[PDB]
Design a protein around this ligand. Structure first.
Ligand SMILES: CCCN(C(=O)N[C@@H](CSCC(C)C)C(=O)O)C(=O)c1cccc(C#Cc2ccc(F)cc2F)c1
Ligand SMILES: CCCN(C(=O)N[C@@H](CSCC(C)C)C(=O)O)C(=O)c1cccc(C#Cc2ccc(F)cc2F)c1
Lengths: 145, 145
């Protein structure tokens, strides 16, 4: 298969394609596939609607090469200052996405895999308990799918 | 079975992959191939929708089908040679048969098809790809940067 970050399997490519085509017909490869698709669409809608807020995010959010997770965390804490909800979680993904895009634009491709790791960290440590306690991603799909 | 910390990471990588792809950027070669193939599949199905009527009764592939029979059926699609167009067709036909299998409440057939396709890709099509420009050539031909 094509070279991926963690393997190069042909199954992974097949499963990706089949997941896509099932979702187009209102079906799902799996619950994870359904969550992924729901979040993509949630992200798309949020970005179009709140497009004015997506300008020079690397500056406003202070994300540069050499940023450390602790700095990333203080920044993202501000988004959730008044509590966690699904809308803010969507925003978290969307802002993170826009930052990876901005990074590549600026020939700072090196930030992409670091932003991914920081997001994962923050999810695990700050958001997972709220998510679990509020129905899991199953509830997200019921609300945003 | 699963694990949620991995789940969260998977969600992150998926979303970022998607958002990068929209700007013509890519997470990895694997991600670039996934985008390109989804797109190629959409275009194939838009052009050849006529061929997707009652595939189940025509392709003679059921849950009890052996891989060798699956192989003989797919071989027929490539009877006159392998080309990029036909490799796209292979995915789209697999996709459509999966959707029908869901329509007919034979969901069990979906994972079987996935496994058969991964094997056929591994054994038949990927070797041809490697003689014809590699996955990088597929991305140049069907991808968005
Ligand atoms: C520069 C962005 C400022 N900002 C913002 O424009 N928000 C927008 C949309 S959020 C409103 C509700 C309905 C979801 C607004 O105020 O209209 C924020 O909400 C905000 C405030 C504080 C921190 C952050 C952040 C972040 C962040 C950084 C890295 C990362 F990977 C993910 C992130 F969310 C975002
Ligand atoms: C029921 C006939 C389906 N079929 C078809 O209608 N073709 C159309 C032309 S489609 C456009 C060209 C460029 C591919 C036709 O015959 O007019 C085929 O060409 C065909 C013939 C023989 C086998 C297959 C297949 C398959 C297949 C099954 C499972 C799977 F996972 C993947 C597959 F490709 C597809």
């Amino acid at each position: 298969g094509p070279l991926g970050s963690m393997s190069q399997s042909n199954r992974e490519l097949v499963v990706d394609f089949l997941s896509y085509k099932l979702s187009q017909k209102g079906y799902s490869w799996s619950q994870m596939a359904a969550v992924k698709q729901a979040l993509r669409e949630a992200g798309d809608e949020f970005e179009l609607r709140y497009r004015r807020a997506f300008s020079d995010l690397t500056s406003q959010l202070h994300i540069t090469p050499g940023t450390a997770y602790q700095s990333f965390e203080q920044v993202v804490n501000e988004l959730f200052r008044d509590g966690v909800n699904w809308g803010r979680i969507v925003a978290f993904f969307s802002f993170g996405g826009a930052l990876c895009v901005e990074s590549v634009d600026k020939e700072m491709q090196v930030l992409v895999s670091r932003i991914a790791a920081w997001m994962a960290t923050y999810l695990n440590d700050h958001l997972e308990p709220w998510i679990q306690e509020n129905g899991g991603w199953d509830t997200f799909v019921e609300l945003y799918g």
